[PDB]
Enzyme design. Structure first.
Site, PDB file in Angstrom:
ATOM      1  N   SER A  57      -7.126   2.678   1.825  1.00 55.92           N
ATOM      2  CA  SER A  57      -6.244   1.697   1.201  1.00 55.92           C
ATOM      3  C   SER A  57      -7.037   0.948   0.133  1.00 55.92           C
ATOM      4  O   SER A  57      -6.847  -0.256  -0.076  1.00 55.92           O
ATOM      5  CB  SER A  57      -5.705   0.711   2.240  1.00 55.92           C
ATOM      6  OG  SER A  57      -4.886   1.369   3.190  1.00 55.92           O
ATOM      7  N   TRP A  95       0.305  -3.330   4.019  1.00 56.68           N
ATOM      8  CA  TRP A  95       0.328  -4.711   4.476  1.00 56.68           C
ATOM      9  C   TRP A  95       0.330  -5.631   3.254  1.00 56.68           C
ATOM     10  O   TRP A  95      -0.668  -5.727   2.535  1.00 56.68           O
ATOM     11  CB  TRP A  95      -0.898  -5.001   5.344  1.00 56.68           C
ATOM     12  CG  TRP A  95      -0.858  -6.351   6.020  1.00 56.68           C
ATOM     13  CD1 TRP A  95      -0.127  -7.439   5.636  1.00 56.68           C
ATOM     14  CD2 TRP A  95      -1.636  -6.772   7.151  1.00 56.68           C
ATOM     15  NE1 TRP A  95      -0.403  -8.506   6.450  1.00 56.68           N
ATOM     16  CE2 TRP A  95      -1.326  -8.130   7.388  1.00 56.68           C
ATOM     17  CE3 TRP A  95      -2.570  -6.136   7.985  1.00 56.68           C
ATOM     18  CZ2 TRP A  95      -1.914  -8.868   8.425  1.00 56.68           C
ATOM     19  CZ3 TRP A  95      -3.158  -6.873   9.018  1.00 56.68           C
ATOM     20  CH2 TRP A  95      -2.825  -8.224   9.227  1.00 56.68           C
ATOM     21  N   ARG A 125       1.018  -1.639  14.080  1.00 56.96           N
ATOM     22  CA  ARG A 125       1.999  -0.832  13.365  1.00 56.96           C
ATOM     23  C   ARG A 125       1.887   0.583  13.891  1.00 56.96           C
ATOM     24  O   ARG A 125       2.889   1.232  14.191  1.00 56.96           O
ATOM     25  CB  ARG A 125       1.716  -0.806  11.862  1.00 56.96           C
ATOM     26  CG  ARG A 125       2.039  -2.080  11.128  1.00 56.96           C
ATOM     27  CD  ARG A 125       1.478  -2.023   9.718  1.00 56.96           C
ATOM     28  NE  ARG A 125       0.054  -1.691   9.731  1.00 56.96           N
ATOM     29  CZ  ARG A 125      -0.728  -1.723   8.662  1.00 56.96           C
ATOM     30  NH1 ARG A 125      -0.227  -2.082   7.489  1.00 56.96           N
ATOM     31  NH2 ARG A 125      -2.015  -1.403   8.763  1.00 56.96           N
ATOM     32  N   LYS A 138       0.897   3.551  -3.130  1.00 55.00           N
ATOM     33  CA  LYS A 138      -0.190   4.421  -3.548  1.00 55.00           C
ATOM     34  C   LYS A 138       0.266   5.860  -3.593  1.00 55.00           C
ATOM     35  O   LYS A 138      -0.165   6.622  -4.459  1.00 55.00           O
ATOM     36  CB  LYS A 138      -1.393   4.287  -2.614  1.00 55.00           C
ATOM     37  CG  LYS A 138      -2.049   2.931  -2.663  1.00 55.00           C
ATOM     38  CD  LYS A 138      -3.295   2.901  -1.807  1.00 55.00           C
ATOM     39  CE  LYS A 138      -3.680   1.474  -1.444  1.00 55.00           C
ATOM     40  NZ  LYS A 138      -4.077   0.662  -2.604  1.00 55.00           N
ATOM     41  N   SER A 159       0.754  -1.251   0.000  1.00 53.16           N
ATOM     42  CA  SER A 159       0.000   0.000   0.000  1.00 53.16           C
ATOM     43  C   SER A 159       0.788   1.308   0.000  1.00 53.16           C
ATOM     44  O   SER A 159       0.265   2.344  -0.430  1.00 53.16           O
ATOM     45  CB  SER A 159      -0.992   0.001   1.167  1.00 53.16           C
ATOM     46  OG  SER A 159      -2.195  -0.659   0.811  1.00 53.16           O
TER      47      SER A 159
HETATM   48  C1  LIG Z   1      -4.138  -3.180   6.360  1.00 54.21           C
HETATM   49  C2  LIG Z   1      -4.354  -2.179   5.182  1.00 54.21           C
HETATM   50  C3  LIG Z   1      -5.217  -0.968   5.617  1.00 54.21           C
HETATM   51  O1  LIG Z   1      -6.308  -1.394   6.387  1.00 54.21           O
HETATM   52  C4  LIG Z   1      -7.173  -0.460   6.843  1.00 54.21           C
HETATM   53  N1  LIG Z   1      -6.643   0.777   7.152  1.00 54.21           N
HETATM   54  O2  LIG Z   1      -8.356  -0.686   6.989  1.00 54.21           O
HETATM   55  C5  LIG Z   1      -5.074  -2.898   3.986  1.00 54.21           C
HETATM   56  N2  LIG Z   1      -4.101  -3.647   3.157  1.00 54.21           N
HETATM   57  C6  LIG Z   1      -3.984  -3.925   1.798  1.00 54.21           C
HETATM   58  C7  LIG Z   1      -3.114  -3.201   0.779  1.00 54.21           C
HETATM   59  C8  LIG Z   1      -2.210  -2.038   1.081  1.00 54.21           C
HETATM   60  O3  LIG Z   1      -1.160  -2.467   1.943  1.00 54.21           O
HETATM   61  C9  LIG Z   1      -3.270  -3.736  -0.457  1.00 54.21           C
HETATM   62  C10 LIG Z   1      -4.229  -4.813  -0.339  1.00 54.21           C
HETATM   63  C11 LIG Z   1      -4.774  -5.698  -1.318  1.00 54.21           C
HETATM   64  C12 LIG Z   1      -5.726  -6.669  -0.875  1.00 54.21           C
HETATM   65  C13 LIG Z   1      -6.344  -7.613  -1.881  1.00 54.21           C
HETATM   66  N3  LIG Z   1      -7.238  -8.486  -1.324  1.00 54.21           N
HETATM   67  O4  LIG Z   1      -6.120  -7.636  -3.081  1.00 54.21           O
HETATM   68  C14 LIG Z   1      -6.115  -6.755   0.509  1.00 54.21           C
HETATM   69  C15 LIG Z   1      -5.561  -5.868   1.449  1.00 54.21           C
HETATM   70  N4  LIG Z   1      -4.655  -4.951   0.959  1.00 54.21           N
HETATM   71  C16 LIG Z   1      -6.224  -3.832   4.371  1.00 54.21           C
HETATM   72  O5  LIG Z   1      -6.290  -5.015   4.047  1.00 54.21           O
HETATM   73  O6  LIG Z   1      -7.363  -3.333   5.199  1.00 54.21           O
HETATM   74  S1  LIG Z   1      -2.709  -1.561   4.716  1.00 54.21           S
HETATM   75  O7  LIG Z   1      -2.118  -0.877   5.901  1.00 54.21           O
HETATM   76  O8  LIG Z   1      -2.846  -0.451   3.480  1.00 54.21           O
END
Ligand SMILES: C[C@](COC(N)=O)([C@@H](Nc1c(C=O)cc2cc(C(N)=O)ccn12)C(=O)O)S(=O)O
Length: 244
Positions: free
Chosen positions: A97, A190, A230, A53, A50
């Site tokens: 995200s 993540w 985190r 982005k 992420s």
């Molecule tokens: C934990 C966070 C943010 O979570 C909040 N703030 O709600 C986030 N992660 C992320 C990111 C970015 O890393 C990219 C993906 C892609 C998928 C997919 N299934 O293709 C699933 C989860 N993905 C999440 O799963 O929720 S991360 O810190 O951006």
């Protein structure tokens, strides 16, 4: 006052408590400081997940692939999370995200223009491969914690190779907290599509005095672990050092 040994021990214990391995790089001016319980991670490459982005938005906005007011409409197809099944701007997708939105932006940009722009800004190992819509989640793109704080540092000071206004537009999307007169800008990340799983929290604190202190937290995410750790570790580390 407090010895360096105590600061290092306290921050290390923050990672030990979470029962994971990680590091947090702090930058003050030109000086880098590495803390945590797995210092060698500082110079190891991990998928940016992420955190990419930030650059994705910089590129899309700069190359006119979208505007900060454009609403990316949900196509009605089931998404990983209900919170993503809605219409949103780049900034909203940033805070949520919302990967689906950024995969669309990536597709608008196109592989060729993306590889050329990633190369131009010199992000991580700069390799995005052949899949323009997932190179930052499962490879081949990778970047180190040190490189992430330098990127945060550059963005914070508008040193990236993009119009001043573009960088400012994106920074506005990253404000995630205000503490005792200090503003915290950052993007969490993540990588679940890789093993082991990597966790990120890269950003910088804007102090009342106007000074900007970049940082990048990087650790191994383990299932049954909360993404908020985190944030907890980062805040406690920043606070222990008197940054916030
Ligand atoms: C934990 C966070 C943010 O979570 C909040 N703030 O709600 C986030 N992660 C992320 C990111 C970015 O890393 C990219 C993906 C892609 C998928 C997919 N299934 O293709 C699933 C989860 N993905 C999440 O799963 O929720 S991360 O810190 O951006």
């Amino acid at each position: 006052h407090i010895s360096s040994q105590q600061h290092e021990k306290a921050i290390k214990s923050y990672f030990d408590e979470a029962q994971t391995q990680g590091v947090i790089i702090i930058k003050e001016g030109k000086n880098l400081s590495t803390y945590g319980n797995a210092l060698a991670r500082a110079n190891k490459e991990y998928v940016p997940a992420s955190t990419f982005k930030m650059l994705n938005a910089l590129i899309g906005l700069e190359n006119h692939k979208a505007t900060t007011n454009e609403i990316f409409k949900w196509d009605g197809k089931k998404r990983t999370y209900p919170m993503w099944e809605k219409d949103m701007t780049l900034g909203e997708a940033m805070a949520l995200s919302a990967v689906p939105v950024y995969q669309e932006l990536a597709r608008r940009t196109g592989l060729e223009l993306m590889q050329k722009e990633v190369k131009r800004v010199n992000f991580g190992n700069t390799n995005i491969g052949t899949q323009v819509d997932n190179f930052w989640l499962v490879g081949p793109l990778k970047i180190t914690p040190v490189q992430e704080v330098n990127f945060a540092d550059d963005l914070a000071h508008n040193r990236l190779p993009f119009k001043l206004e573009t960088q400012e537009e994106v920074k506005k999307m990253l404000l995630i907290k205000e503490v005792n007169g200090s503003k915290i800008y950052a993007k969490s990340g993540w990588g679940m599509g890789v093993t082991p799983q990597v966790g990120w929290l890269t950003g910088w604190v804007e102090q009342a005095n106007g000074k900007k202190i970049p940082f990048s937290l990087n650790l191994e995410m383990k299932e049954g672990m909360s993404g908020s750790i985190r944030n907890e570790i980062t805040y406690k580390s920043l606070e222990n050092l008197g940054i916030i």
